[PDB]
Enzyme design. Structure first.
Site, mmCIF file in Angstrom:
data_model
loop_
_atom_site.group_PDB
_atom_site.id
_atom_site.type_symbol
_atom_site.label_atom_id
_atom_site.label_comp_id
_atom_site.label_asym_id
_atom_site.label_seq_id
_atom_site.Cartn_x
_atom_site.Cartn_y
_atom_site.Cartn_z
ATOM 1 C CG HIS A 124 -5.171 -1.499 1.564
ATOM 2 N ND1 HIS A 124 -4.123 -2.361 1.326
ATOM 3 C CD2 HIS A 124 -6.088 -1.750 0.598
ATOM 4 C CE1 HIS A 124 -4.379 -3.075 0.245
ATOM 5 N NE2 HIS A 124 -5.567 -2.731 -0.210
ATOM 6 C CB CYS A 140 -7.119 -0.767 -2.821
ATOM 7 S SG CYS A 140 -8.820 -1.128 -2.345
#
Lengths: 165, 165
Positions: A124, A140
């Site tokens: 992301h 992440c």
């Protein structure tokens, strides 16, 4: 074509469905064999996805170097700096795929979210550009907004992501 | 009994599916006309979920008090201490629902993870009990492992979660 996944030790029907962001019902419908249970090594099909090996793009992530490398036909195109998981909440290693995407999720997720085939995990953007290039995430992979946007515009769902030390 | 959701400006099929943790295929199967066009102000059904109206439990989260309060038939039943998001990575406010749950996903998520109807947000336990009672998370609600285990055994998927400052 189709995306083939090989069952690993400790996978359940539920966890696999979860990793791929689909219902167990859909997974079962696509794999009548799964009525009889799961076994490590067993190949099954994940519905909704193309054959990742037919996609010439490939993403290689190195946790140690804090980089994401985009290749086309095994020739590097672009290397990006990234943030990765902290020491006690690391980015998982292994072979993954980009499964789905949402544009402009906002907040800490920035310009894009690209789901990886592990639950809770994805690539992301960020609203903390200082974090890029550091082991500070809860797992992440973070990029600059402009990078994830460029990345998303190029790689289709199903793209292979290989995460190494 | 079906969960209905009123479409908001800016909503897309992908962002709705991500919020409710279902594939776009499952969303469309339940709402066959949406691929011709999503319309703000219109209602659609989210599959896999009971009508929240029917659930007599209700959860209230106070970000300022760092508490999660479980009510039943409008009487408080239990109050739990929680961690909430830092000032730069806030627990989001508004009205949500518990969408799904995973037993003991381990690691930073502790004994349980319960998805909220906002993408990438949930209620979970923790491998860091000292964090409970503080605004220190990345936006997720953290509870002690014992407390989230208890909470999960009590409330069904579809339980309303009201989050206030």
């Amino acid at each position: 074509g189709m995306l083939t996944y090989q069952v690993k030790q400790g996978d359940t029907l539920n966890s696999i469905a979860a990793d791929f962001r689909i219902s167990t019902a859909a997974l079962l419908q696509a794999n009548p064999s799964l009525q009889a249970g799961l076994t490590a090594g067993q190949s099954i099909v994940i519905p909704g996805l193309p054959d990742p090996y037919t996609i010439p793009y490939h993403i290689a992530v190195s946790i140690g170097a804090k980089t994401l490398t985009l290749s086309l036909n095994n020739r590097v195109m672009k290397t990006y700096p990234i943030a990765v998981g902290k020491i006690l909440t690391q980015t998982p290693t292994g072979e993954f795929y980009i499964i789905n995407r949402q544009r402009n999720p906002g907040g800490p997720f920035g310009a894009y979210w690209l789901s990886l085939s592990a639950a809770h995990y994805g690539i992301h953007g960020t609203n903390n550009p200082a974090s890029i290039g550091k082991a500070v995430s809860k797992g992440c992979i973070r990029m600059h907004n402009k990078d994830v946007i460029e990345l998303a515009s190029i790689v289709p769902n199903g793209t292979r992501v290989t995460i190494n030390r």
